[PDB]
């Protein structure tokens, strides 16, 4: 997957998310892929019905499987619908997005500042 990230570096911003970021992201924008449909989680019973066969019984179980990359991370992550974030509330912080974060832009690995970016985008 690191080679994939290298291959799409000019089009994405990525980094290492913190537990606060993951929890807020899943609580605010968490949607399940149930029968090919985008289903708002909004209740622990939905998660038990679709992920309980992996022992995931709650939204905190799902978050735990995300934050510590567990044995069933693939299934939990794929169950999670891709997050639809907004534009950052205080902006991108740079004049031009499409340079590397290292060169004063936005794309590439900004590893720990991804938390700040995602909080503004959430």
């Amino acid at each position: 997957t690191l080679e994939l990230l290298k291959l799409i570096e000019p089009y994405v911003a990525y980094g290492y998310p913190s537990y606060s970021t993951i929890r807020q992201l899943v609580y605010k924008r968490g949607f399940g892929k149930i029968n090919k449909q985008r289903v708002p989680l909004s209740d622990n019973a939905i998660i038990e019905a679709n992920l309980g066969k992996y022992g995931i019984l709650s939204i905190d179980d799902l978050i735990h499987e995300i934050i510590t990359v567990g044995p069933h991370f693939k299934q939990a992550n794929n169950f999670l619908w891709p997050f639809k974030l907004s534009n950052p509330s205080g902006g991108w912080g740079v004049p031009r997005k499409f340079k590397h974060f290292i060169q004063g832009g936005s794309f590439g690995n900004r590893e720990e500042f991804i938390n700040k970016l995602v909080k503004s985008m959430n």
Partner: protein, 51 residues
């Protein structure tokens, strides 16, 4: 019919995650840390202060 955001609307926030009341009652978001008087080694200090 409406997605209600946790992180607000404490009622939905507590419908999910029953542990949230224990978290907010014990103030687990402001956990006081223990005191340790560990000192960095001198070699670490000179390396940091070098040049």
């Amino acid at each position: 019919v409406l997605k209600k955001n946790p992180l607000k609307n404490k009622q939905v926030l507590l419908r999910l995650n029953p542990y949230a009341k224990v978290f907010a009652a014990e103030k687990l978001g402001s956990k006081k840390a223990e005191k340790t008087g560990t000192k960095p080694a001198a070699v670490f200090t000179e390396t940091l202060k070098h040049d």
